[PDB]
Amino acid sequence: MTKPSLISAKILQHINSIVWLQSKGIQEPLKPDVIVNNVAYPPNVIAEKPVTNIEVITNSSMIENTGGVRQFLCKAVFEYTIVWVFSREVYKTYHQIPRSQIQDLLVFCQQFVISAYQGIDPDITNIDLKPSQVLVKPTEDVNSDVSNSSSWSVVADLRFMIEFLTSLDEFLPIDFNKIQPPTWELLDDLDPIVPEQPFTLNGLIISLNKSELPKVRADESDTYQLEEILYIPPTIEDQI
Amino acid sequence: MTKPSLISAKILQHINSIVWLQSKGIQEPLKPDVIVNNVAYPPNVIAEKPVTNIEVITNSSMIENTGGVRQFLCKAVFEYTIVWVFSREVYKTYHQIPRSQIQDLLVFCQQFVISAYQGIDPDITNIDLKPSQVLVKPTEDVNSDVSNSSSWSVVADLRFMIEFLTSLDEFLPIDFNKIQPPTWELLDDLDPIVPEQPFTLNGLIISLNKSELPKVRADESDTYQLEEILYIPPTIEDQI
Amino acid sequence: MTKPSLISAKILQHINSIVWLQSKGIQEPLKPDVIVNNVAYPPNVIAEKPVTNIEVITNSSMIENTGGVRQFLCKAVFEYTIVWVFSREVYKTYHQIPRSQIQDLLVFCQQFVISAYQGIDPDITNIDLKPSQVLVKPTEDVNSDVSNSSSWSVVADLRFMIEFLTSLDEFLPIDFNKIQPPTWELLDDLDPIVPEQPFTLNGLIISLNKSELPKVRADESDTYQLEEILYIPPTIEDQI
Amino acid sequence: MTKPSLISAKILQHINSIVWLQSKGIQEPLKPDVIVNNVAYPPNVIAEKPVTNIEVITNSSMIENTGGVRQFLCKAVFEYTIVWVFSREVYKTYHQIPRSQIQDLLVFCQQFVISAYQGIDPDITNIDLKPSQVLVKPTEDVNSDVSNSSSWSVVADLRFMIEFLTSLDEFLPIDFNKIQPPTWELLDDLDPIVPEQPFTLNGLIISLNKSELPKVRADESDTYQLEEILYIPPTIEDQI
Amino acid sequence: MTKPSLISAKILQHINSIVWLQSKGIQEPLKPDVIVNNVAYPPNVIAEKPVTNIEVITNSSMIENTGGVRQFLCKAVFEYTIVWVFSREVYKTYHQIPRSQIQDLLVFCQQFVISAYQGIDPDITNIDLKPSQVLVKPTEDVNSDVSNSSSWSVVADLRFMIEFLTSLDEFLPIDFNKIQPPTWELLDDLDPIVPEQPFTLNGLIISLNKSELPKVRADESDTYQLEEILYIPPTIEDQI
Amino acid sequence: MTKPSLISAKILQHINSIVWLQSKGIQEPLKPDVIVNNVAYPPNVIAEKPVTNIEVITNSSMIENTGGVRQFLCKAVFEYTIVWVFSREVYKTYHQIPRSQIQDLLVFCQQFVISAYQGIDPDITNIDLKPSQVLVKPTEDVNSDVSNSSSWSVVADLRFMIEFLTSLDEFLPIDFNKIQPPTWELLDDLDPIVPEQPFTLNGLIISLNKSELPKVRADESDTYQLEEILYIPPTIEDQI
């Protein structure tokens, strides 16, 4: 269904049991190493990137015409960036930083997000992985030790290509509450085109014709006689 | 048919029930948050980009030779850019801006424009979607809060690849009224090449020949005798 | 046949009934809006770009070996650029400029040039269209209103990929009159290689041999006797 | 299995009997030529690059559904850079440096790492080689001789594309010890989604129904009679 | 065969009856318009570019193993650039320059070079054309009129992809006369590897063996008796 | 086999009878024209570029599993650059330099290196040619004549893509003599992983079992009786 519920489930699966995310924001942390259980751990942040490549193809075999409202299959790329900052005070050389454990944590998150098909949204039809990039670039302006040497920053991206089912009926003015008012005015004094409304069958009228002897024709009015006009629920009489 | 009627229908489907477009113009808004029902909403704008990739292929199976005038299938890319400006006065951190709702609004517009095949123009043969790009770039020069920090700008593009039927007969000098005068002069004193005009059959003349005994030949003038000259409507006699 | 006659026909089809071309030249116009019938119209220009991608493939099924002179199929890309200048004095905002009508005029020219197969040259075998680009770039240095704001320029290109038949016999020193003298001298004192000349049959001589009894051999001179030497027109006797 | 054990085995295979690695670090060496057995050898270093292109495809024929926990196939690119510094004091001209021996050492390492399928990890399914690049760039700022001429640096990369099997069960909080605390708190006060736990069968209860004479139906409760309730281990009685 | 004879034939076909080449050199001409027959013509030059993409594939079906010396098929790209300078004194506007005639001259040269398969070299197996580029760039620093406006330069390239047969026997020290001395010394005191020399059969010796009764064996020396030793020309006796 | 022996053979084939290489080094020559037999020839140099694209695929049909040691097929690109310097004192114009002879010399080297399959190394399985590039760039800083005009430099590259067989047994510590000491110490106090050693069969012991009447089972110890223990060479008794 809707991408905000899906993205909330995606970040929940991300931080579920794999990555510990101390803060969420676009900024390398300048906090000291975090002390928990008398053990020091590096600062980290997560940047949730805006959803891109939002495309609706209507051209997949996994779209069922249920006959109520037209369904769609939507493709999206959901991009998350996790950054860990390793201070140079404790990590003197590049090779002693725990890059291996970061890669292990990254592959574990990839496996957990891929396996959780039924746990992210029921309407997910495909989840695929783009090749992840791991960078050991320096921090933005974060210095640790004497001489003002830049701290080690380990940056890992996760880009999930995900295909899921949607319908028109899933979107309501409640999810647009802080961006768009319901029932606004048209920008050029035009009328809004109202979509179709689900039609309810609250009466049926049948008018049958008794055709002439050779065969039914149904075009000329003298070749058939009106027999009766039938209202399938008797209560439709005198109502419409 | 013609692209201005089609583009008017396309923008109408866009603002129909999905995106609320406060203004139309190439400029990030410096208006305050718009107050409606005592609720504040971010400023927005739409840029309707000029139609590009206008190509006529005449090489598709959905072009019927009706025998009146030659039809064409035209492909075009119609590009719309919607920009929302979120002031930093209310939205202090990047992650608290409602990117999810913007993506939901974008996917809803994509679904609505794709479904409305019969509502945009009857002569649409294909509508497809390029991957949409969502950017969280800063505003052009719009500052909100103290220190003159740039406001958040959420930019979303929609590029519709659309294939539709056209004919020569659909274009008249009325739709060119403010760009081109009808019946202008040639730039090098040349003559204008007049296209074919629909021919009306207002008389038919048949001259049949009685051929010689072995077989019809129809080349030599002594091997056939003129019998009669027939004018299919009798009123063509003494007229032409 | 030859590209100058073809290009003259191509520009003639262009300005025939679609685009009104006020001037032909590589320069955005600084003339005022042109008044015709008391109606003001924007200035325009056309740039006819030099023919590029001139390739001769001799590898198509539409090349007939007529046995006189070797034919060729030539491919070329013919590029025309039409620029309209819309003054900011009348057109205050970008969205009120008549981009839709420009796109309509462009698609009409594309359809008219594509349909006119028999009208441009009889030897055209294919005409195809590259995707057209429509730009709303500013004018070169043309300012309209106060503050010296650059005028709106609408630039539309048309690139026709066109395949046509040619032969060696179609090119004569008349079409090179102002670029090359006929019968020039070789740059390194070399001799010019004269192409083959159409051979005319003005006499035929047959010398037949009466072969020996077992079979014709035709190699050894004692196994056949000369019977007669036949000159097919009697007037070839005593002539050659 | 896990990439840190695999990478430790990969560097071990690298330095096993092929490359002699004096130091491990991102820096061209400024140490003098190393004297061993009264023979001088050039300084060298190895840079172990961070693992990139970590992708989990779950779409290979070499993934067995064992029915315990879902397996995965992971692809990774492991990149090692070996740099040798040849002083200009001994190596006066470029062509007398032993580039051939470096290329021989490089091809030997490539062959040894490729052959050792069973020696790096048992769960390796594929090891492939990207084209190696050998550079004779100068040193960073290392000068040897008079005039401060830059020393010769021979840089050779080895990029192994490697596909291997993984499972969720292979990752424990022990391998994340210095990067992540076990059993942390959720960043938005959310609950952690616990993965499935291996279910142990410590009792089985069977309730069979005696169906009516025509056939089993199993939907309506009057068409079958409860016969007995069977506990497969007798000790499950009075326990659950 | 050899490329210098082929390239001499290629430039000869170029200037044969199509392009008039006043000078050959890499430089836009500053000579005045050339007066011949009291008619003024624009200056021109030709740049013969160095042969590139020289590749020997030995992997084509048009290479016959004649059994004397191994043949090859060589591919080359031969690039010629013709530049015409049109003074602004006579050619005031861009559109009045005779670009059409230049394109006609270019297509005529392309057709003539393509047709002349038997006239350039007998061993040509393929001649193909890359797409030609025609530029209306300004001259290098050539000014014509007042204000020092740059003259019009029309630049047209011709790149012939050509495949031809070669053999080792075609290259002799005569064609290298001014670049390489015959019979030079090896740069590292090595010996030169002499190619095979055509072997002439000036004698034949046959030694036949009379085999034992069950069958020929030809391995053990007691199972066959030497009968005679035959010298096919009797004069080989007492000679070798 | 090993690339240094192969590269020595490759440069030997290069200078064998085709290119005369006066010096080997990365530098355009400033020596005068070389006088031999009273004839002046241009200076030249050769740059042997470091071997790149060293890839071991183990995925070709030309790799035989001999069952001793695992073989490999190695691909490499061997790049040689030959530069000739033509002084402007003798060569006044560009077109009079002997580019044709240089191209002839280049194609002859390409043919000779391609043909010499059995002469470069016996284990070559493929030799292919990349498209060669011929440049007429100026010299680095070499001036000839008055005004200090840069001398003509003709640069031709030869890039051989070559596929050849290798094995682990071909590499010994003798070929690494000046780069790596034999039997070095591990960088992290690890043990070296010794490769398999060729196993020699110096004794065979067979213990056969007499099975029970219904059939051989070979799992339970009571269903078979030990008959004898056979040592195939009698001298293995009392030895092991």
Author numbering:
A (entry chain b), B (entry chain a), C (entry chain f), D (entry chain c), E (entry chain e), F (entry chain d): 1 to 240
Sentences from the study reporting this entry:
A-1(L) is a Myoviridae cyanophage isolated in 1970s9 that specifically infects the model cyanobacterium Anabaena sp. PCC 7120. Using cryo-electron microscopy (cryo-EM), we solved the structure of A-1(L) tail machine, which consists of three parts: a 205-Å-long neck, a 1045-Å-long contractile tail with a complicated baseplate, and six pairs of tail fibers. The dodecameric gp2 portal, the pentadecameric gp5 and the hexameric gp7 sequentially constitute the neck of A-1(L), to which five neck fibers are attached. The long and contractile tail of A-1(L) contains 24 rings of gp10 hexamers that form the tube, surrounded by the sheath of 24 helically stacked gp9 hexamers.
In detail, the ring formed by Loopα4-α5 (residues Ile83-Tyr99) of 15 gp5 subunits is hooked by six long α1 helices (residues Met1-Leu25) at the N-terminus of gp7, whereas Loopα1-α2 (residues Leu20-Glu30) of three gp5 subunits tightly interact with the Loopβ5-β6 (residues Thr70-Lys75) of trimeric gp82N. In contrast to the initiation with two separate proteins, the termination of the tube and sheath is fulfilled by a same terminator. Each terminator subunit simultaneously interacts with two tube subunits via Loopβ3-β4 (residues Thr58-Gln71) and β5 (residues Thr125-Leu135), and one sheath subunit via a protruding β7-β8 hairpin (residues Asn202-Ile240), which disrupts the inter-ring interfaces of the tube and sheath, and eventually terminates the extension of tail. Notably, the A-1(L) terminator is structurally different from the previously reported ones in the tailed phages and eCISs. The tube and sheath start from the tube initiator/hexameric gp18 and sheath initiator/hexameric gp30, respectively, but both stop at the same terminator/hexameric gp8. In addition, structural analysis suggested that all pairwise interfaces are complementary in shape and electrostatic potential, enabling the interlocked assembly of the symmetry-mismatched A-1(L) neck.
